[PDB]
Amino acid sequence: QTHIKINRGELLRGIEQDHTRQLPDFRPGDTVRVDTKVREGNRTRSQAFEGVVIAINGSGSRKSFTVRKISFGEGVERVFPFASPLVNQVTIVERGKVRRAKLYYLRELRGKAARIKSDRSRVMK
RNA sequence: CACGGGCCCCACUCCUACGGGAGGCAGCAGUUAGGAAUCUUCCGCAAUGGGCGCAAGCCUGACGGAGCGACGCCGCUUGG
């Protein structure tokens, strides 16, 4: 039982943001020559900067944000929706006037690599 | 139609501060090694040659040979 006549949601949206402190980046801009990079773990620390060379794309909804809309090619595909909400990662990058496909996720394509898949999305067929 | 210049693709010596790169020198030669075979990381850079600024001049692993080999053959000696 937790329903009567009171609006308590400043924990669900207050205490929620009581811990935040960030203006992400928020650029869905695809195909960038360089970007953010996780702090890694492994040894004691040895906080390295070479997670994944993303194209940057996506958004999400609150403390979750399926960030990665990248994967690669040496390993077929391979996405792994990382957590936008974290205090252990490099503070992003942004570049590219971007010919934007659909933004956010896609799932399709992602196998139609070949060659002409640089930073565009229209095609004649 | 680029000898070591480069772009692209595959095997891949090796280092990295994890983005990544400089990629084969069967040219004289070497190390190793496939193995019947093919010397030594050679000598002078006198002397032949190759390219130019007037030219000297430098560079030059081409050269004269050193030299690995009874490696094939030519000539000689192991007393009359």
Side-chain angles (χ1 to χ4, degrees):
Chain A
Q1 296 187 179
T2 312
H3 174 293
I4 14 78
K5 192 181 78 289
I6 292 182
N7 165 46
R8 290 184 176 182
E10 75 135 299
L11 278 69
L12 179 275
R13 176 198 302 177
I15 296 301
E16 169 59 13
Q17 194 185 300
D18 189 293
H19 324 63
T20 36
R21 290 295 279 196
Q22 41 242 176
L23 202 294
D25 181 1
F26 214 65
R27 169 88 78 67
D30 297 62
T31 312
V32 189
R33 286 146 177 68
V34 64
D35 201 25
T36 176
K37 38 199 76 289
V38 186
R39 310 286 72 257
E40 316 299 73
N42 196 193
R43 206 157 48 68
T44 42
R45 34 170 44 187
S46 183
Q47 304 179 60
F49 35 62
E50 228 298 297
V52 150
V53 189
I54 57 283
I56 320 179
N57 208 179
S59 296
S61 306
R62 262 290 73 177
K63 271 58 175 293
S64 298
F65 304 116
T66 50
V67 179
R68 206 115 300 164
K69 299 294 171 57
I70 304 101
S71 81
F72 271 134
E74 276 176 292
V76 187
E77 320 302 317
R78 312 306 86 207
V79 186
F80 51 109
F82 186 75
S84 168
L86 186 74
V87 200
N88 185 282
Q89 87 290 165
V90 168
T91 176
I92 49 78
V93 188
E94 56 184 7
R95 169 82 173 185
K97 155 68 180 177
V98 302
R99 287 66 68 74
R100 51 180 86 266
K102 208 110 285 83
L103 288 75
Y104 243 125
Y105 42 76
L106 205 169
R107 302 267 63 179
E108 265 61 55
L109 193 77
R110 193 169 179 276
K112 312 191 197 305
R115 189 265 186 182
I116 309 175
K117 302 291 181 306
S118 75
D119 188 51
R120 287 182 294 294
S121 172
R122 288 196 310 172
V123 324
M124 196 169 103
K125 295 85 183 297

